[PDB]
Amino acid sequence: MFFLKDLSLILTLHPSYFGPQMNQYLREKLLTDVEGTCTGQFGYIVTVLDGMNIDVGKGRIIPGSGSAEFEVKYRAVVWKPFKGEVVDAIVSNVSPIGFFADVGPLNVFVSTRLIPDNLVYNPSNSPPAYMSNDELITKGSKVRLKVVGTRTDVNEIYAIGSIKEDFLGAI
């Protein structure tokens, strides 16, 4: 889910950069640094509200090094999953041991044991996909799936869902 997040980022600037176009250079550095990153404490930082209008304030010179420190405060948007939250998706991969579904920026994997037993896999169909008497899961399908697990890995996180519960699955 998307959360509106006030967040900051302390930075260090070399004296060589101490020019007349400083604030815009720090704005570009901030925009490069934060637009796309994941953090286990926040979720996923897709964009930043009012990117060009971040305030760098007044930086402080660190005694002994000569580099300036800035507390560039701004309000951004973050996307975080939670166990027990329902998230829609579209399947990406298929395999006998389960399938992958792309959710937002991420990819959600559902295990074989967590699938209605009327669903039967087919490696030979065009397109290859799960089928069922009155149920279908092919590439491009919609899946209203609940999250029952989210691992926090620092660089990339992965979520394994479960469509075994009522009111969930194909819609």
């Binding site: 286990g40 404490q41 005694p63 002994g64």
Partner: protein, 93 residues
């Protein structure tokens, strides 16, 4: 650079020179503290870029501090006498 030398540098108001005498011309060290519990019990693996305070089960709010090695030794001796010195990097009240 004893205590009376420190008094003379304080009278002169030369704070940077005093800090440089006592740190970069002497036993300067680097330690990691837990931002939550404030003990120097943070296990740091710099080549693997991984940190942990196992008491607080913390891995994200950890800071490094440059302090005299004698100060680190003092805090470890205090911990050895069951005294907990907690180094906090921000004021509350």
């Amino acid at each position: 650079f004893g205590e009376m030398e420190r008094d003379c540098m304080i009278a002169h108001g030369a704070a940077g020179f005093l800090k440089e005498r006592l740190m970069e011309a002497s036993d300067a060290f680097r330690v990691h503290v837990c931002g939550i519990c404030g003990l120097m019990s943070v296990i740091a693996n710099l080549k693997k870029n991984q940190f942990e305070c196992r008491s607080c089960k913390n891995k994200t709010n950890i800071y490094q501090l440059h302090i005299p090695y004698a100060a680190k030794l003092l805090f470890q001796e205090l911990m050895a006498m069951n005294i907990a010195p907690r180094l906090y990097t921000e004021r509350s009240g």
